[PDB]
Design a protein around this ligand. Sequence first.
Ligand SMILES: Nc1ncnc2c1ncn2[C@@H]1O[C@H](COP(=O)(O)OP(=O)(O)OP(=O)(O)O)[C@@H](O)[C@H]1O
Ligand SMILES: Nc1ncnc2c1ncn2[C@@H]1O[C@H](COP(=O)(O)OP(=O)(O)O)[C@@H](O)[C@H]1O
Ligand SMILES: [Mg+2]
Ligand SMILES: [Mg+2]
Lengths: 542, 523
Amino acid sequence: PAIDAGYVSQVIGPVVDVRFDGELPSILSSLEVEGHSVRLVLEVAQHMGDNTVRCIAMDSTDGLVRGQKVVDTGSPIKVPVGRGTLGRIMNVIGEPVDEQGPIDAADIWSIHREAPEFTEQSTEQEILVTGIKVVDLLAPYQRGGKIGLFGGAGVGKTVLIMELINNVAKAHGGFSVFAGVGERTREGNDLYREMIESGVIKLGAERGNSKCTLVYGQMNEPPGARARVALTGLTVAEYFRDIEGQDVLLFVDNIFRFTQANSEVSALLGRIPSAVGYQPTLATDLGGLQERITTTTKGSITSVQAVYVPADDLTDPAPATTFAHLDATTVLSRSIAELGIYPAVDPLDSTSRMLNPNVIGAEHYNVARGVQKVLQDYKNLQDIIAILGMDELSEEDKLTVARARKIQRFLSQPFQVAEVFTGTPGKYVDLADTISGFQGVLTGKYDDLPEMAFYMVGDIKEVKEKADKMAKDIASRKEADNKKVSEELKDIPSLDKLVSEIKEVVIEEDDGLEEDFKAEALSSETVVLNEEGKSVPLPKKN
Amino acid sequence: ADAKALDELRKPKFSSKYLIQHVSQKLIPAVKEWEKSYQPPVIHLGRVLSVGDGIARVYGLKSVQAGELVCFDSGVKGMALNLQADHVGVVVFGNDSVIHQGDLVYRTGQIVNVPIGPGTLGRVTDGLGQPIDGKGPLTNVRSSLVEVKAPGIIARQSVREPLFTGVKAVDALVPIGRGQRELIIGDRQTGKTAVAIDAIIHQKNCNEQVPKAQRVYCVYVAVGQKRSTVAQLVKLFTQTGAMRYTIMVSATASDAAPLQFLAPYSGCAMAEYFRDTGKHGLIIYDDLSKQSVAYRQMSLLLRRPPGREAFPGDVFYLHSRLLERAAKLSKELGGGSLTAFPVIETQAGDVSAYIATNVISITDGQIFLETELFYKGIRPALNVGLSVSRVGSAAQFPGMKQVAGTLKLELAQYREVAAFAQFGSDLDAATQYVLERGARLTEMLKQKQFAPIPIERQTVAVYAATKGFLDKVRVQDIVAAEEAVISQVNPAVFKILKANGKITPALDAHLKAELRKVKLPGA
Ligand SMILES: Nc1ncnc2c1ncn2[C@@H]1O[C@H](COP(=O)(O)OP(=O)(O)OP(=O)(O)O)[C@@H](O)[C@H]1O
Ligand SMILES: Nc1ncnc2c1ncn2[C@@H]1O[C@H](COP(=O)(O)OP(=O)(O)O)[C@@H](O)[C@H]1O
Ligand SMILES: [Mg+2]
Ligand SMILES: [Mg+2]
């Protein structure tokens, strides 16, 4: 009980130093702190050198005293994995935070492991149809690949990642894991409640028929919990890939917050900071996590990760390092969103490795490359169109600006998760309707239609449905004077009879503020503790 | 020099005691002649080793908790940030010029507290809960921690109820739900406070008309402001009667940077009294961009490595752990709520700055206040194309939701048509309907300060504008046509629209009838 039970030696925010009198814990070991108000586990990060470990708190450290007993659990953070974890919400250390009882577990896996080996990789590319036009055309997603959605605070990468949950994750037929890393807790409650009414999560005795397990380390957590909750989301996804042997969908909302939480911690671990202010170990910290999120020869993980870009800077080293770890990068722009185009996907900055004529076919590939060619040549014109206007263009170039304004609107589409605030019902567009629709605008079959008919429509059947409506409206606009339901006697009572049908409510006048409240009698003096711990008034000197 | 060689020096290895026995009889006489030169030793108390930059290094304090109130013998509070092996670094809640090297540091035994309760309502307190309005101590109150963790996923529910701002552009286009945090972001001098003050004045008008459980108790946190601005604001709340429901937490520009850093957590803890007891709070953090500058000062004076714009790495966690406490609680937790309005000042309209984009990633919507619309007299200068409220939409007034769908759309066309041709190339008759209706609705939405409008007078005024009833007036007397509308219609039509919530078809053509017998000033 004396050795292998260390004591807290110093506390600097999220970073605790524990001194062990003998047998130091290994690096990445979990350490419980005895006598804290909540369960405080500490993950050993460094051996400092004088029988001291430096460790990271997975909860708050306000309350730690410099003698507090710390027991070593002899192993890393081990979280419940299995089919019993489906339909549950876990935090970083595997505790259920959904009040549904304890998580019955097939196994309790540590959240730290190595990547699958090079002999364990699987090199197969089949497409993942998402129903999104700009995605399925220009940067198509791979069915076992890594997908990144790059965004700059309000451009739409949570709406896009909830749309992929809506489109892909129901027709997938496998298990999903949603690791929420450092995002809003309101959004964790929204997804959890909307999965219960979708039947993706089933509560009670039918819990085993759930298809999704949630791991949440949201933005109220201390930076140790947000730095490790992506790792316990993968461990749940890796059990379904390795042991259960099946196809998983991992959705990681803001994998940037993993990098940012290690950057809050790294200042206090005594490290010289790297470029912009990040950890010196940014690429290997992120690399060690991302290399675990792969498709192996035993199972598949289709991983969609939102990547926040800070201050809209794509050259920031946390977005810039992530780009190499992904098979498909969907870059969402702020200027595209200010033109009202949603999803705000930059068509000339989003990239897939699936855009290859031997993978998606030459008809799909030539449309995507032709769409990108007129959008690029239009971008080359925008300096002149701003200054000189379109009147100074060649009419060869005016056909570019006319077509590229049309496909820019046609890349946008309504979402079935955005209908609750936009009003417009959402359109799943099939891949064959995407390819044929943009091929028509490139050949010139739809230069008749105005450029606003292409805006927020499903496929090329519906731009003709919307252009007909636009033409029809410009004719019929008014002549609704009377002989409608607004007659002052048919459907309508007296106005003063409606006053009396109001149920008048009673108003209580007293504000209800001192019904249960108990007031601490605060003293007229600052109450302090003397050398023997006694509650003493503040003595009188300086 | 390893510890294997140093822990051999535990066991005695001298075998010759001719100097141990000698000085053991002369040491206590030696110390006794130097006792007026010894400060008394310190183990559970503290003694200040170094003070400067607003950080004290305190020897001793063997059993301080991390992050608890310590009290200097000068009477100043501190907070034990880092407990080190040899000292404790405390951050001084006040002026560090009154702390000396050698001063006693006393332990209060509690993590940092503010008085919360019903008796903090009405008062002007500082960043630590000590009242500065001069009218006594806080009574009918109890202490609560300022660093509570936000409620989790299962302790929350969806945002259902509307928080009426009384601002016409806000409650129509960017409507605020009742557990929702909403950023007010704009340049200097753009009406950012005026939107937050009109919300606080408006809740006073509604608390005498709701049955005690739907009462909003506002809290205004002023970080980094001038003390004359705060005193002019307390006078405005006192003369409108809004201080009966308002707490005013003030850490001004002359206060210490740890007081300005702590003041939004102090005020959030006072507003979390109403969230936790089933009531409803409204917290305003005026210049949360000034609270990050105060925290950047403390982090650079603690010699922590700066990142982008020299802000620390955890300046996101500074604001995210704060604004996450603005929640709508579930019904087993009382159903209470707290809605936040952070204010971020923007430099030259640049929304892609560091602290601005941090709070956009935290909050649920924005109210962008454009400098260019504010110079044209369109006040509140609400950038309609950029201001969002997605949590508060489908939680708004059902009558306003009927008429503002056309209002947002006719403004959506108005921005799109004005994007094409503002200078007179050629004017269509269809697009000059849009510029005639768009300038109608823009003059409709601009309202003047410190007079928030009820939501039933606000639905009717937009009903009179998205429909006909105002196309006669050009653009100029539309402000005078509104009180021509809202005073000349029968005041019973505001009572049925309030009590039903929406425009029934019985009230629909009644209100068409009252809007045809109002006399419009443009004739
Ligand atoms: N709706 C309005 N109608 C008319 N005048 C207004 C309105 N709102 C604000 N003003 C005036 O414009 C100025 C803006 O003041 P306010 O304090 O609201 O802006 P602010 O953005 O908080 O400025 P600061 O950043 O300096 O605090 C004030 O002088 C105010 O009197
Ligand atoms: N596909 C979309 N359709 C309509 N509106 C959208 C779409 N994507 C984003 N938005 C708007 O932009 C805001 C961005 O929100 P969110 O997607 O949560 O941003 P973030 O990328 O910061 O997570 C949304 O609240 C919504 O108003
Ligand atoms: Mg998001
Ligand atoms: Mg102001």
